[PDB]
Point group: D2
Chain length 450, copies 4
């Protein structure tokens, strides 16, 4: 079953029950590429932004109250997720997001028609707007919400789990490893204090990009000049959005031309996500190597079972690879704007929103189902600390580097302890007493735990 | 929702679900992306399980009634009848063990409906490991995507560009180097260049097939083939080749390399990334040639596909070139993810397979679909502004050089300067300056300024 | 021809005139890979750091004044660039930079020997140090100096050149272009205000990474515990470095383990550089397209002649490609640390310092030799503004989008102006007077400058 | 010191146009590499030869160019190319640099040459610079990289053979797995390198395509119609590089650099394989006492300035750092490759720098890795076999004799008492009528399990 709809290019056959109209149906036929459309968070931001625009147009007396009420009601239904099946357009559509903007306009007009209100998708639902300012605004609203309300709390949860282990394992001495080779002692707590700082630095990196990620193009209309919008449209809409979302990070753009010609805020934010992926790869790799074996590996810690494969470190490192790939796609799209508009917005939006979701979800899972339940093999870790030939290092000031190197070489060759080799080489005397040797070779004291 | 009793405890599974306890545990363990295996991956897993059951039956290791049940169930999966029965996230255990168990459980639940009891591990996973099966299904899917879908889509795009190269063989225009006016070319010569880039793309995909088609099946847990028949891999591949017609599928040259690394996926992604680079150039040139109507280059007219703007009435945009360049960006990004996963294998197993499979199979799908749309909805309907193109070519200071031997460097530069000033052709400027005479006839001038001859 | 030197692995033949010793010579033979060694800025930071360590060891009474004076004098000579030919080790060496650290120790010992002072490269010149804290410290000193003293001033120069054009061309009306297609009017000044903001945002992005790029590992020694160093070594050395360089951005690391196990500060900083490269690509591309033709292109502006091919926009876009490549190498190395040490430091250092240098140098050249001298084709730009059928857009509130679309389509088909098509379609009346039509279709007023 | 033409250094063989490019592009401070300069010399000599053959260039002028160009190709004037890599995107500046240096060399021999009219006869920079880039890249692949990879392959294959029976436990997900041999693992690494050589050989049909003869836009205007085929014939005869050919399509050959992007993909895959091989080797060599200690790498230098006697896996570290650089260079190459416009891709100097560096780094590090690391590796045979014989993963073949429950009990006790599975079976008194000592040694034969 089908019905006839029309646009300025002509008549289009639209499925009888569909709430979208002619322009969405053209886009369905023009872009069957990935088979995936906008995400729930994108549809929510478009619905929120359409409702805020109707409210401001109503406040400025440009749109009749009956029409504004119809738009606001329909836009609220869309934002709440009651019509996600009415957004069938592929991500890989026209680069401005024109087709998804018209999808929102057409669906609102159809919802309002059911309520007995006639709205023109362009003249009423899109009053004072363009896709050029609306689609990147909805993208930056979704990205800012993902960063502030989801990713930062997830990272804070992971930071707190790592910090709890840094405290619990403060004196769990082990051998440090540099270049994968036996080094001087460290504590498992000190290593986890390093992982915790990497995550805290990640939170700082996300926060540092919010002044530009939260910049919205709304009000710039077609090219940034604000033509066909009231001069204070942007400031008024952003105030409505801040009041409704509670996201004080949302702001009008510093420059209305930069806000539409470029998507540099998304490139910057993806760089912060890419850095988080890089830190997470190091943390997850160290954790699966510490849990490796038991017989053929390091067997330093035991990971919670979900013979235990390190499944959450594998999920983490796979997510990090995806974030790195997504980051390359975002920068490629970001560089290729032309004149008044960057036309890679739907692709850049897919990738940045995906990177926020993956990092948010895998960070919470890693914290709760892997980090929280880790157990240390305390006796084995102490034995490893004591067996490194590099424990000879604190003797450098007493016997010199060259003699200390001869001690380590001989201890390994003769299968003797460093302490015994120092004694055997006749190094005990005025420069090093037996009591000093024993103080210097104490592995926990050698870790200099705070 | 029905309740299933496992070795650890109790677990609730949706009533209409054909998966069982192990899949439901993986659903609860990995809520990361909310996206599971794609249709092509599910099909390849179904194909592989059917071929394994066939070989276990042939070798007398599996009872014929059990083998027939697996084959019938696996054919339903390969036919795309159960794409809603694979709920596990892409971001799972790196070997793809969870998706391998999902396939075994779904097959057992399908066979149970037919009144045959199957053990997911002992029967459906007989002679197999996930470490050899999941990368095998990935390489089957990738080989099928290359041979049966991408190469024909690129061939369609090549033929559309080559048709324009022929139709516009004599459509002379000015060349552009560094974006500046250059000596004449034809639009057909430019489109012959684009057709060659796509032909080279097909050659690049064909070049990776000897290694993309290598399958790990039979190598079991670490590549040694322990707990599998010694000829399990050769027999399974022979069945797969006979059923699918994919002659590129083969047992791996080295069973350890085939599980420790996924270098064939990295190589194939390189070919897709080069195609994305070529398509970026072709699409960018096309949208620039179609720019306007009055403030751009206006060399060609693209077919109108939809209204261009919600605010600027009557505007129409190059939407298919934009979809092509956005797909290319995605392929470049997917390619970086694939290489990252490929480098980070350890010892006997590379544990980035589900992420690498997602990315390479998506790149194949996006390129296939956008190349066909680009050919059909854009290239096929392009029209050239022939008179405009020839007039610019005939007005170019770049074509004064053949006058030098008749009127001199200084007068040819004066002709070039006046033509630009009066917006006239070089030919009319020569006539206006009264240069036609004994030294230069009108016939000699038209030979010297023959722009189509200059394009060769 | 050669002399014998030794280390804990044995005797090594070293060129007779070379100031380096056994361990540098082993590294010369182990790593002939790229044929390129440390840059002048890296050798300067290593020399500065070695001198600061000797000063603090002397202040704490751990190193005799004669030996400390000899190290400080030799380290100053190295920092000033008097011995760069004595640093022959490849960039692609052991991942901690052990070989370049021993190169600095050995060269200082040889310089001091000429002055009659015997120094042991490990026991004296490397007292309280490790390559694990020294090489990333020297890298982060060089990177912070590159950002603060070179890149930010270069970007400010480019910002000021772009801003000057935004002001000079404030009312130079032209047609906006979206999707490469005719759009509504803009001014050339407005577009350049956009480019200027991209560069200002780039400066903000660099400044935002300085709290972590300026973090130094110095004092953490082998693994971050500070073993074999005084407990306040790092704080004391950083104070000396801040006093000598004037770089208040240099600080002790928040966590000594993170500072050696990872190089996330360099990954973060490279992300800022990559974003600058992305902005520069857009600016340079718009500028070469505006100068394209003349006959076959847009012919909006004239670029200054230097070799007119847009040679500086080509240099800019090539540098941006290199920064994007370098950024991928840096992130790859950054992710692959293990346990107490990330062993990709010499590769990450090469790439980040190169990205800072290329962006600094190409930004100054682009500002001075391209942007400053641009000239606008004012009459042609006005004609372009007036010819876009999208100038029908301000009539949407009077005649509606659908009728405005019919106007644009008819004006293009009949080769008529939008004004004439509105008149011809009989749209003048109560909803639109001729005086309103003329106010709405004025292209400069339409740009809302 | 300085000479005027603009001031040019006295000992410089370049002239005014090169000096202007020096002043115009102070960006990186690095110019053309030796291989690029050589390819430009080869190309200019071959062009002069063909112009002479076709009677377009006087023999005295042609002989002067050929002699000068051979000096450049022989690497006698690598200090005469001062122009930055980051120059005009066509490489016009470096093309003029070559023409001016040739004219200054010929002037010393008493022959006057016009850099443009004689040395650049029948040419454009738009066809010559990418031609010299593809010659250099083809030579780097065929004459240097493939032989270096073959050396590395042969070193890994020698270890695959020497350690054919060195049984050890496999590792999957970093966890204990069924037995393998160190020779089987090294056979996998050798295959990765052999597949790397196949990948490089697969890109040669397109890497070797040359634009020469296409002139400014690919039409061949102002060149003889057979200029390209004649120049390539001379280049192939002189160099022996049979992979060099005229391009399939003259427009694609100048509008795009897709052959460089394809070749960089092959180098990036080699970097990915080398990362896996080098990481496994440094992990197998980890220790001496807190790591895996499966193998011993040859000592190449003292490991630490502070930890005495420590020795590190420096060659694997150089290999993984080169791989990171190749990945980065590959992203820069693809970026440049996509951004051509109409008749010319203007990212050639940047793409050439990156691809030629990737070839050089991979060549040099593969030879060092083979010679200074792989060749001298030693296996800890007894340690490897003891761990394999103590693995719970080898109890599965006991199931048919003693049952799943008793085999798991054997596995649990072996781990508890740090004994082999064999000794644990004997200690639990499982040897009898059901299971003889001969049957037990057949069931627990770890080398047979590795097949």
């Amino acid at each position: 079953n089908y019905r006839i709809e029309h646009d300025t290019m002509g008549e289009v056959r639209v499925p009888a029950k569909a709430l979208w109209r002619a322009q969405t149906q053209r886009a369905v036929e023009n872009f069957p590429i990935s088979g995936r459309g906008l995400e729930r968070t994108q549809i929510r931001a478009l619905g929120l932004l359409k409702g805020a625009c109707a409210q401001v147009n109503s406040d400025l007396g440009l749109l009749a109250p009956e029409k504004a009420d119809a738009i606001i009601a329909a836009a609220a239904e869309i934002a709440d997720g009651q019509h996600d099946d009415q957004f069938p357009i592929d991500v890989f559509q026209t680069g401005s997001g024109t087709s998804s903007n018209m999808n929102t306009n057409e669906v609102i007009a159809s919802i309002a028609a059911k309520g007995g209100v006639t709205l023109h998708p362009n003249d009423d639902v899109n009053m004072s707007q363009s896709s050029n300012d609306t689609f990147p605004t909805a993208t930056h609203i979704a990205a800012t919400e993902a960063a502030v309300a989801h990713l930062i709390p997830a990272l804070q949860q992971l930071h707190d789990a790592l910090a709890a282990k840094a405290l619990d394992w403060h004196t769990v001495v082990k051998s440090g490893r540099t270049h994968l080779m036996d080094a001087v002692p460290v504590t498992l707590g000190q290593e986890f204090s390093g992982y915790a700082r990497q995550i805290e630095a990640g939170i700082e990196r996300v926060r540092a990009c919010l002044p530009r990620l939260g910049e919205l193009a709304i009000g710039g209309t077609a090219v940034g000049t604000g033509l066909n919008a009231p001069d204070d449209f942007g400031v008024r809409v952003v105030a409505v959005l801040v009041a409704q979302t509670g996201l004080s990070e949302l702001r009008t753009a510093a420059n209305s031309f930069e806000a539409q010609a470029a998507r540099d805020g998304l490139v910057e934010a993806s760089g912060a996500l890419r850095t988080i992926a890089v830190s997470l790869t190091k943390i997850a790799n160290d954790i699966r190597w510490m849990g490796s074996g038991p017989l053929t590996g390091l067997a330093e810690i035991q990971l919670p079972d979900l013979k235990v494969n390190p499944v959450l470190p594998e999920a983490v490192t796979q997510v990090a690879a995806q974030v790195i790939g997504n980051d390359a796609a975002i920068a490629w799209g970001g560089a290729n704007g032309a004149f008044e508009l960057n036309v890679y917005i739907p692709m850049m939006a897919r990738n940045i929103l995906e990177s926020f979701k993956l990092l948010t979800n895998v960070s919470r899972l890693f914290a709760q189902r892997c980090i929280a339940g880790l157990t240390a093999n305390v006796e084995h870790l102490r034995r490893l600390a004591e067996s490194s030939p590099s424990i000879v290092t604190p003797l450098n000031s007493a016997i010199g580097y060259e003699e200390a190197a001869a001690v380590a070489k001989q201890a390994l060759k003769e299968r003797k302890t460093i302490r015994q080799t120092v004694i055997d080489r006749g190094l005990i005397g005025d420069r090093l007493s037996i009591e000093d040797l024993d103080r210097r070779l104490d592995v926990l004291a050698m870790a200099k735990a705070e």
